[PDB]
Amino acid sequence: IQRTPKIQVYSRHPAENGKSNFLNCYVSGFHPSDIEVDLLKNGERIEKVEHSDLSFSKDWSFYLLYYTEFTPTEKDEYACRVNHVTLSQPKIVKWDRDM
Amino acid sequence: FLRGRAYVL
Amino acid sequence: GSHSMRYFDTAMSRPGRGEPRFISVGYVDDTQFVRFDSDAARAPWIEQEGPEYWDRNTQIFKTNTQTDRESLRNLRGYYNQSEAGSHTLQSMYGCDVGPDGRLLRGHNQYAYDGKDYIALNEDLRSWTAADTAAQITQRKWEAARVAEQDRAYLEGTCVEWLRRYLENGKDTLERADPPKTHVTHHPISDHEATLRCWALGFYPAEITLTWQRDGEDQTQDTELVETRPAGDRTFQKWAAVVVPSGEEQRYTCHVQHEGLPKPLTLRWEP
């Protein structure tokens, strides 16, 4: 009766150190719709993250895109942290430029 | 354009 | 080509935190064009519609909100549920049309707590009920001639407005953006490497990405991520296979997409 979110973390454009871009966390395949999503920079929560309007796929499962503008550097690490009723602990997915 | 709901479930 | 209009509606109860939240989001193909939200404190081509359009749609949204709120109360009863839990009613409805703008088919279906509940059949005249609770709904809707009303919307309003939106939004809605593609290579170990075929910046979302080895589909050995939104109207996807070092040229990535003059065949280029 409940479905756990899939999570992808990635950039809007191919990443280039020092160039302004958008960091995305796409959560999908989940039910019910309540969900907590945070974008992290070096472990800390980013403020003023935006998100898309709640919608769902043909199988009824929900999806949301959370995003923020960012300028990638070689040192900084980014991640997405997600909590949902189906998760005992928040799941963290790291941004890997090659995925 | 929205569809009006004809009747309650 | 062919096009669709679809609304995706979600009503969710929240005992102790006010009345259920209702949200309806409308799409043409993979482009969201409108959002109505009962908690609220639209696309460019829709902005030209003006006051008669918005007042009427706002009116319909308010009435639908009332109706979905009473549906949630009824559903709680049909399933012997307590007043303490949160529950969700969803629906998807809309029409598909061909290149000539004629109706290909209509849709109006509902789900409760994530499970199919009742749907209008393709004939636009009968219902398919999932369970004994939905059979009660079916009974009511047959008595009140609901299918006739939904069919009127699907055959009329839906198709006629989809046509208008396509005309007003033709520069974007009728434009397919092809994927920008490349193949990357990452050693996993001394004996294996990952080949990853990328597709970026494409619209609409529908795409086919496959790896072949010696011309045979590697369906089982391919990792294929879900197609994902870039945030700027376009979509992204990749497919990866693990390959024995030195055997990279036996592998080809194939890309099909509406925006492509012709299908791509890609290989790793060291």
**Per-residue H/E/C for A28-82:** EEEECCCCEEEEEECCEECCCCEECCCEECCCCCEEEEEEEEECCCCCCCEEEEE
Q: What is the CATH number of domain C1-175?
A: 3.30.500.10
Residue C163's CB: how many other CB atoms inside 10 A? 15
Is residue C267 within 8 A of residue C252, CB to CB? The reply is yes
Instruction: State the Cα–Cα distance between residues A19 and C183, nearest whole angstrom.
Output: 23
User: Which residues in chain C have Cβ-Cβ distances shorter than 8 Å to A3?
Assistant: 114
Kind and range of the H or E element at A87? none
Q: Please name which of C250, C230, C251 lies closest in space to residue C240, comparing C-alpha atoms.
A: C251
Is residue A36 within 8 A of residue A82, CB to CB? The reply is yes
C231, A54: Cβ pair inside 8 Å? no
Do chain B and A touch: 3 or more Cβ pairs under 8 angstroms?
no
Is residue C185 within 8 A of residue C248, CB to CB? The reply is yes
Q: What sign does the CA torsion over C93, A85, A26, A45 have? A: positive
Nearest to C24 among B2, B7, B9 (CB): B2
Is residue C154 within 8 A of residue C127, CB to CB? The reply is no
Instruction: State the Cα–Cα distance between residues C36 and C196, nearest whole angstrom.
Output: 40
Instruction: State the Cα–Cα distance between residues C87 and C81, nearest whole angstrom.
Output: 10
DSSP label at residue B5:
P
**Nearest-by-CA chain C residue for A56:** C8
DSSP per-residue letters across chain C: --EEEEEEEEEE--TTSSSPEEEEEEEETTEEEEEEETT----HHHHTT-HHHHHHHHHHHHHHHHHHHHHHHHHHHHTT--TTS--EEEEEEEEEE-TTS-EEEEEEEEEETTEEEEEE-TTSS-EEESSHHHHHHHHHHHHTTHHHHHHHIIIIIIHHHHHHHHHHTHHHHT-PBPPEEEEEEEE-SSSEEEEEEEEEEEBSS--EEEEEETTEE-TTT-EEPPPEE-SSS-EEEEEEEEEETT-GGGEEEEEE-TT-SS-EEE----
3-class DSSP state for residue A83? strand
Across the beta sheet with A78-83, the strand order is A44-45, A36-41, A78-83, A91-94
3-class DSSP state for residue A16? coil
Residue C204 CB contacts under 8 Å (≥ 6 apart), including other chains: C29, C30, C176, C235, C258
Say how many residues make up chain C: 270
Distance in Å, alpha carbon of B5 to nearest chain C alpha carbon: 6
Mutation target vs B (from C153, C155, C158, C166; most B CBs, 10 A cutoff): C153
Structural domain boundaries in chain C:
1-175, 176-266
DSSP label at residue A3:
B
State the Cα torsion C22-C27-C33-C37 to the nearest 10°. Answer: 0
B4, C60: Cβ pair inside 8 Å? yes
Domain A1-99 indexed as CATH 2.60.40.10: yes
Burial A86-99 (b: 16+ CB within 10 A, else e): eeeeebebebeeee
DSSP label at residue A19:
S
Instruction: State the Cα–Cα distance between residues C141 and C206, nearest whole angstrom.
Output: 35
Domains C1-175 and C176-266 equal at CATH topology level? no
Distance in Å, alpha carbon of A72 to nearest chain C alpha carbon: 16
Nearest to C228 among A8, A62, A98 (CB): A8
Burial level of C178, CB count in 10 A (0-12/13-18/19+)?
middle
The CATH T-level fold of domain C176-266 is Immunoglobulin-like (2.60.40)
**Resolution as reported, in Å:** 1.8
